[PDB]
Amino acid sequence: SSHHHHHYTVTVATGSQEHAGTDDYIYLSLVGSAGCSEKHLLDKGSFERGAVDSYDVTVDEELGEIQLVRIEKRKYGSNDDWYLKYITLKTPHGDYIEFPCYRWITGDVEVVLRDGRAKLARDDQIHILKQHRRKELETRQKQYRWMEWNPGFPLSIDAKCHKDLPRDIQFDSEKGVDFVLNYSKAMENLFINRFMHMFQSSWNDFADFEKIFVKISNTISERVMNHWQEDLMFGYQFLNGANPVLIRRCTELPEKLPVTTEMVECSLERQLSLEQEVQQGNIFIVDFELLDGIDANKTDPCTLQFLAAPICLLYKNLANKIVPIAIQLNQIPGDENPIFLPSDAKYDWLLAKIWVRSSDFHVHQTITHLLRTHLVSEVFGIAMYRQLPAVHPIFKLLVAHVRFTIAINTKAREQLICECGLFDKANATGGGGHVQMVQRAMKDLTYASLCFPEAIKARGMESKEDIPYYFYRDDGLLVWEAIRTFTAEVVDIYYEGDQVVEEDPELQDFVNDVYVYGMRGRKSSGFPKSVKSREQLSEYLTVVIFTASAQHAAVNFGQYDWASWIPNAPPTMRAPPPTAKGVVTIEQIVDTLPDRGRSCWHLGAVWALSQFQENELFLGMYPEEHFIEKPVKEAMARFRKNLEAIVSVIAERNENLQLPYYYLSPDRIPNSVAI
Numbered sequence: 316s317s318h319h320h321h322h323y324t325v326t327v328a329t330g331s332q333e334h335a336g337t338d339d340y341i342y343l344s345l346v347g348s349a350g351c352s353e354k355h356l357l358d359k360g361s362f363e364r365g366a367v368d369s370y371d372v373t374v375d376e377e378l379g380e381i382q383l384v385r386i387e388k389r390k391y392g393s394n395d396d397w398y399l400k401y402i403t404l405k406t407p408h409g410d411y412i413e414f415p416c417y418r419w420i421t422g423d424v425e426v427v428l429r430d431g432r433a434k435l436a437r438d439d440q441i442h443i444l445k446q447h448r449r450k451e452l453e454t455r456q457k458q459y460r461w462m463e464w465n466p467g468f469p470l471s472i473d474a475k476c477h478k479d480l481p482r483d484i485q486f487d488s489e490k491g492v493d494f495v496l497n498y499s500k501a502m503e504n505l506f507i508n509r510f511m512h513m514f515q516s517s518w519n520d521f522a523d524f525e526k527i528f529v530k531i532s533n534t535i536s537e538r539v540m541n542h543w544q545e546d547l548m549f550g551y552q553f554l555n556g557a558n559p560v561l562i563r564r565c566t567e568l569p570e571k572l573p574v575t576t577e578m579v580e581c582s583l584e585r586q587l588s589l590e591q592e593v594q595q596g597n598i599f600i601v602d603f604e605l606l607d608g609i610d611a612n613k614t615d616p617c618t619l620q621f622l623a624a625p626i627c628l629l630y631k632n633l634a635n636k637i638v639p640i641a642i643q644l645n646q647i648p649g650d651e652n653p654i655f656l657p658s659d660a661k662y663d664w665l666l667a668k669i670w671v672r673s674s675d676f677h678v679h680q681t682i683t684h685l686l687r688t689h690l691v692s693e694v695f696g697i698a699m700y701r702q703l704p705a706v707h708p709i710f711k712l713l714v715a716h717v718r719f720t721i722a723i724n725t726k727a728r729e730q731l732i733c734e735c736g737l738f739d740k741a742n743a744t745g746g747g748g749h750v751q752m753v754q755r756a757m758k759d760l761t762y763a764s765l766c767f768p769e770a771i772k773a774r775g776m777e778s779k780e781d782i783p784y785y786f787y788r789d790d791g792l793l794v795w796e797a798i799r800t801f802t803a804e805v806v807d808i809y810y811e812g813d814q815v816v817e818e819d820p821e822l823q824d825f826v827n828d829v830y831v832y833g834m835r836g837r838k839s840s841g842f843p844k845s846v847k848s849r850e851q852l853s854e855y856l857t858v859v860i861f862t863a864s865a866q867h868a869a870v871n872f873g874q875y876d877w878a879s880w881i882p883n884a885p886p887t888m889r890a891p892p893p894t895a896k897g898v899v900t901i902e903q904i905v906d907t908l909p910d911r912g913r914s915c916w917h918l919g920a921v922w923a924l925s926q927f928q929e930n931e932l933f934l935g936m937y938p939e940e941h942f943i944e945k946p947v948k949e950a951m952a953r954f955r956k957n958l959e960a961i962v963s964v965i966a967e968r969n970e971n972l973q974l975p976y977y978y979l980s981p982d983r984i985p986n987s988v989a990i
């Protein structure tokens with residue numbers, strides 16, 4: 316695809332996208348320490364998609380060391396956008412200089428690119444480079460401003476629809492990544508259009524839903540189908556499901572749950588008492604205080620949707636497996652909030668489990684998944700684009716991990732979770748309830764909650780010896796330390812010491828745009844207002860990236876496996892929680908379960924949101940060479956080797972498991988949060 320033009324040897328790399336070529340005029344200038352260059356007109360032929368064009372440009376006079384490159388595109392007619400990858404120069408004196416672009420040029424502005432050697436402001440001392448940097452930040456801050464989408468929410472990009480973002484942060488495709496289009500296209504692909512708007516109609520039994528499900532089911536999905544009524548599967552999801560972040564070891568029984576040793580005698584397997592067992596550390600808890608006060612979806616007057624705020628008490632049996640031993644569906648005990656038990660009627664216990672699952676699904680969708688992953692990543696991205704110039708070593712590193720984050724969130728807000736959005740179709744927290752969740756969850760979000768080892772230890776889930784079957788933790792720690800090592804290497808490459816980090820003005824303003832605008836300047840978040848050490852900078856970028864890639868994928872890509880069997884992850888409930896024991900029948904649960912119309916939308920949503928791209932970039936795949944220097948390439952190479960080793964470790968582990976756990980295998984962890 317190489318084309319040579321003959322009258323400095325200039326090589327321009329055009330993008331591989333479906334539209335990266337442009338037929339407009341492209342003029343080029345070389346800005347040197349001893350002079351500037353005329354606007355040289357490139358070939359008249361249109362730059363092609365995936366192209367690499369070479370041109371001979373003769374300078375009238377010695378320009379000295381080439382520092383900057385101006386690129387202008389003037390429309391020949393009907394101006395179309397052009398994705399520039401990089402520009403290489405082979406100078407007369409025998410020097411090869413690479414300028415990474417990787418940006419959309421739509422004629423609107425003249426783009427100015429700098430050498431691919433990563434630089435800190437402290438390194439720049441001449442008017443040429445400094446003016447470029449200052450002006451670059453001026454326009455970055457003109458282009459990337461903050462906005463509050465909903466009160467108490469983290470600040471997001473200033474835009475109403477997708478087309479309102481800078482194209483550099485838009486999707487490569489016009490309508491390529493669309494919630495409406497991909498969800499409906501799945502509902503057709505999954506062969507479920509007949510139920511797309513078939514509300515107020517209930518599935519007559521499990522068998523009917525099962526016959527449609529077998530043809531679309533997966534491995535983990537079919538296991539869920541065969542084992543969703545088992546205490547073992549119920550407890551297993553609390554460690555290795557799609558939302559394995561809520562369980563905490565119980566060191567003292569909550570006073571609000573008046574559970575008794577005599578109540579759990581049958582589940583207990585050590586001849587110890589319930590309190591004695593808590594003293595031993597074998598009792599675990601999942602408390603849904605965050606669902607108390609959430610308003611259920613009232614958008615459908617012909618169906619009442621209901622939430623709960625359960626407290627689930629679980630036990631680690633002689634097999635070192637965590638299984639549920641007690642469930643109270645609401646927060647304040649009484650005569651109408653029974654504590655259901657595995658000894659109760661089959662369907663009392665089953666309905667308790669169904670409600671616990673529904674609550675976990677609501678938390679996952681809103682708190683675990685959206686807020687703590689997407690919106691955090693978007694905050695980091697907006698701060699990045701505002702405060703770190705493209706020549707900064709932190710920008711070159713994070714740009715690949717915040718790719719498609721702003722755009723996916725904006726598309727969500729314009730199609731998915733807006734007022735009367737697709738979210739309200741099947742979820743009971745539509746109409747505003749989920750909004751309140753985020754607000755209430757905000758004050759619980761802290762910088763330590765995003766640091767993985769601290770987060771694991773904070774709930775007491777640290778000991779692999781006492782809690783051996785926590786694969787999510789085991790893989791997460793491997794990946795976290797891998798990324799920490801990679802980030803440490805980069806930091807050490809670019810910061811002589813803590814003084815250089817501390818004196819870095821653009822890093823500090825980036826951190827502060829995260830603290831003030833991202834977290835709203837809330838003191839109780841724990842976010843650094845300034846980084847003064849390389850260990851702290853490493854940890855900060857580690858939080859950023861791990862939230863943007865590994866954690867996000869762990870919370871997203873278990874949705875079709877585990878939520879696909881609706882009884883295992885109900886998006887809504889159509890009856891209030893049972894207030895008495897021995898009064899509920901399997902039929903009544905089927906009637907409490909979602910209708911046929913919401914079924915299709917939930918299934919399509921989890922399937923569409925559970926998808927990898929055909930040419931997706933996984934952890935370490937950095938095709939866009941923003942870094943072009945040798946030491947940083949070696950650091951990336953080591954990153955890749957350690958990741959591949961972890962892939963081997965995780966595969967060998969999966970070979971000996973009932974149900975393998977592949978979500979934290981780096982070969983399935985994208986770079987950024989694109990869904």
Ligand SMILES: [Fe+2]
Pocket residue numbers: 684688867868870871988990
């Ligand atoms: Fe996600």
